[PDB]
């Protein structure tokens, strides 16, 4: 049966089943679910990927285990900035991904990422 | 193929499910993993039920998703991830309230985004992954 | 899981790869109808875009060692419901016999002329 993954600190941050980690769509939220870094896509992207990494790590994996990222943005003018930070977190062989533009849960949010990883 | 060990995916079509709006099945099952198609609050003949009622639409959607997962041999507790699509954030609270009812105990991972849906009266759509073997 | 994921980059073809393979599962990136310079081919033709996209996806899956019949799920993104029937018509040609599960939603895509984008999950022999 699935394990939930809740790093020290109606969905959980991630789940683990049969060696597959599913990380929830993650935004740049403070502890009160307010958006951090309102007008700054680079710092939002960094905060998101740091959270995702901690979920995967809590499960026993690393970012190299990520097979797929689902990226959701609100403006294509931010794509270059988001990509720049994203690449820093995946230095080796890159995951597969999509990046689509849509609406996100809070008005200041500029990016959200959900992630699938295969761990040992 | 099947005789060689690579068992093909099984399509999952619950007893009574009606004709789909496009070329897809209610769900697929391969190697113990169930992929449920994006599910909307459709009647037979693919009209949207409960036009201005996001709670009733969410309930109908999760009942359908549950039947797919049960037909495949699992339960809602096996769901690892849900992809939720909505048209209006004013409905988020209502959708969440019903959603919670269907996943008592440890909750799945999920996302929820706002986008366009295949019919104008549709307020919510959900796709689902479940590990059942 | 102990063995790292394999990237799938078919001979001849931003920080992603066309697909990954791990434990018999192929994740194909969201694929659009791009030429060699990342311009959208077939600007006002959703059918020809869809065909190009599904041929790309097929080649990724084949490079990984599978076929389209191994596809378990497709995520489809479109810009205009007026194009839904057309996209569906071409989609069906690529999955004869038991169809995958899928979703189709309307959203924004990376280039204005893109009319469809598809990402795919497949379970291949292993």
From Swiss-Prot, chain A:
Keywords: Hydrolase. Its EC number is 3.5.-.-. InterPro entries: RidA_CS, RutC, RutC-like_sf, YjgF/YER057c/UK114. Gene3D superfamilies: RutC-like. GO terms for biological process: nitrogen utilization; uracil catabolic process. It catalyses: (Z)-3-aminoacrylate + H2O + H(+) = 3-oxopropanoate + NH4(+). It comes from the Bacteria. PROSITE patterns: UPF0076 (PS01094). GO terms for cellular component: cytosol. Signal peptide: none annotated. The keyword Hydrolase applies. GO terms for molecular function: deaminase activity. Pfam families: Ribonuc_L-PSP. Homotrimer. Involved in pyrimidine catabolism. Catalyzes the deamination of 3-aminoacrylate to malonic semialdehyde, a reaction that can also occur spontaneously. RutC may facilitate the reaction and modulate the metabolic fitness, rather than catalyzing essential functions. Contains a hydrophobic cavity in the center of the structure and ligand-binding clefts between two subunits. Belongs to the RutC family. This is 3-aminoacrylate deaminase RutC. The lineage of its organism: Bacteria, Pseudomonadati, Pseudomonadota, Gammaproteobacteria, Enterobacterales. The gene is rutC.
């Amino acid at each position: 049966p699935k394990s939930v993954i809740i790093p020290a600190g109606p969905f959980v941050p991630g789940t683990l089943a049969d060696g597959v980690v599913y990380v929830s769509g993650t935004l740049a939220f403070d502890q009160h679910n307010n958006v951090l870094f309102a007008d700054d896509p680079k710092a939002q992207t960094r905060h998101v990927l740091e959270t995702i990494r901690k979920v995967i790590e809590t499960a026993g994996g690393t970012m190299a285990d990520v097979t797929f990222n689902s990226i959701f943005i609100t403006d294509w003018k931010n794509y270059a900035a988001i990509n720049e930070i994203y690449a820093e977190f995946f230095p080796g062989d890159k995951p597969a991904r999509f990046c689509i533009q849509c609406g996100l849960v809070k008005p200041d949010a500029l990016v959200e990422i959900a992630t699938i990883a295969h761990i040992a």
